[PDB]
Amino acid sequence: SKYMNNNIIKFDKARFTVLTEHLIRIEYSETGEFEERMTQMVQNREFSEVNFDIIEKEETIEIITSTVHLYYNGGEFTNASLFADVKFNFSVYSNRWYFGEKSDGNLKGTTRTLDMIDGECPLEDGIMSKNGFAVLADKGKVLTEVGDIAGNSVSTIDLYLFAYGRDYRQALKDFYQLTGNTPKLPRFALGNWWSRYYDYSDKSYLALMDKFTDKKVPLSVSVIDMDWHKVSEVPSRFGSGWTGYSWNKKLFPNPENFIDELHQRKLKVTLNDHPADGIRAFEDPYPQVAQTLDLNTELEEAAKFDFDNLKFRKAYFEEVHGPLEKEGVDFWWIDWQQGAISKSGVDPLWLLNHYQYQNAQKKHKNNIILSRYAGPGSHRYPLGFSGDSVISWASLDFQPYFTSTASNIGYTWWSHDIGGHMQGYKDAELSLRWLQFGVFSPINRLHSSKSEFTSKEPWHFDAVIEQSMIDFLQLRHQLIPYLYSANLITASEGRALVEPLYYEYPMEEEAYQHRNQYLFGEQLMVAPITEKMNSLLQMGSVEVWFPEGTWYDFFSGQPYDGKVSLKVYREITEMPVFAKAGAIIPLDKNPLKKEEIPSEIIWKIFPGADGEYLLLEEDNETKAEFVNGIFTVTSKKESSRKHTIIYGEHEIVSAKRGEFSIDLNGKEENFDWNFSTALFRRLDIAEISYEQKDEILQQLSLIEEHEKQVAFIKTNENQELQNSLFELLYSGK
Amino acid sequence: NNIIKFDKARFTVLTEHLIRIEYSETGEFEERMTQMVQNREFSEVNFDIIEKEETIEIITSTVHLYYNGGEFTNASLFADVKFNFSVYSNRWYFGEKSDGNLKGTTRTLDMIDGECPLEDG
């Protein structure tokens, strides 16, 4: 059969597939046979036919779409024979791709891990570029129909040219169509996780879980780190106790009972797995694995780690994990730090995440793993696990940027160790700022090193820090409805929960100049504080870009007239999070109560414009509509759910059942936030002279005209104090 | 008896803790001294072998040395030491650097003001 889809062009030894007007597959084959199989990266090349034009001559071909000219001059792919011009003017002369060459503009993607990183590390390129094109090489192995490694591609060069311009959201959508959508997360993954590299007993671990309840901190996940298994008692002839599959019965004399007690507390349970030293002769499962793999047990022959080997994988899932799953382990923390070597040339991290994520689905519907990034397409195996960050202001300052930038390669479920993993320095404010970021990150998992000094328990800290941490951990559970809805949107529509500003505001230069600022779902904009407070102000700060429109602090209702770039100041207990006029945010009214789905939703409405919110749940869709001051709630299915409505400052309706409409036009649109209260608070906490406090309070109270209030603060000899006062006068204008 | 051949490789267990590893395309292995090596006469030692169709394992009191056949690559030739001095730096891979080397020396201190890099010992 000579039949070919109309989107396929062949010329010399190349094949071009025009998958969209802005996405061209580029293949080279010595043999004239081109690759149809799935690869590690690509799952789907079925794209609806698109319009394009060809200029084919003897010696050259040009493929022309709405956004790109692709040229091929025959022969081997070199920087001279294969190149493209984009039909954009985002740069004066960075509008040409050359095969095998780097161009500027790439907005970056992510990397394997933050292991041993103190602050910034280099990132790999993503598919997003300010100049409108990027090339995603497919260097992976081909897969069989059922998803096992098949060997080398017959397309010895296989590339994807993205030429979406600054339509970043559409580039990511089409990347997901190509590599497969992110699977749905389960709701439990979006709550708080407790983890610590600490040799807990059953007793001490349950006592901690019960103290979390006593302290009014909700948790969804109980992580148990490597001290669950034998460590120091492993005979040295076998190597270290890092890898283990055998319970420490001194700490866990009845593992199934312990896991059942965590299940009764509605916690999902994961164990640390260090797979690299395989199954050695001292292990509980060794007799059964040695039988299956026909090992020499009198010579203590180990079942060495080999995820290329179908029999090893089968032994690993059925005979090593299987018994631990039967005891009640819900999902696996794959903790691989042992390199990228295999006989197949496939990264063992890729093999682990691919096969473990598939195996997890027998255990539970929409199950997860926790593992490091395994390259483009590995978003199919959530969750991401960033690993052994250094505990530092510099590490925190990198992390929001790292997180939002990862959306540029579709890896949208990074779980960082909140408060940082190891080394570095103690600073309770650092631990608190890091938790603020974690709550507004894809996953909020508390974790720490083996130190006796790095517990992330709120009560480790003083009464102020402890209370603020408890408040933020409660907030995480309030946000689960919003997070779970955004999760179902990632899985169904290919939209990241965390977006860089330039996704919404691609033509605004300031959207590229606030590296740690992001959109958090569709209704909230976050600007985490990631530097130690100024002790004179007793407040930290971040420069915020406010896009055009009216914005409100999500917590205080402090207003801000966009478009402006404004330095904003917050006490260590407060975080900069903002909503536009018209925003509607659902909150669980009962974040401490372990309900499978919330019995009551708070609808938090920001007055001053129309808005809309769709709450996706396991078995329902709930639409909130705010049009000409009328707030309406409707659902796909009937339910007993109670709805609370908070319109700006004020609870209007409490615990109303069913679908309803309510006219909010006759209700107070204004937040209580006011200039005079906020000014008094900022002056009162500041470690400045009382004479300065007195004069600033007197003059700003006395001076009526806003421009002369600003002139007065402009004379202040403390420059950061001027900025803080300016923020208040700007919100109060 | 201290000598084992497998595929295109020759292993010589000189001590319980010292193993020569040779590759030869032709199956001819080198007996002559080199600039570095002057003597390969060492007393017999005890060690075990697990030889299969496609793989060999040599086991001493201190090391597992594995060879999976073919040219020597990081994947085909590697070893686990029977020690627990590190949590996961106990594996040698052919042609890869691992941590822990306490260093050796270098040709000269010509033009060196303070420290210079040393070669591995």
Ligand SMILES: OC[C@@H](O)[C@H](O)[C@@H](O)CO
């Ligand atoms: O299992 C011990 C490890 O050091 C873990 O605590 C880290 O989180 C792994 O990255």
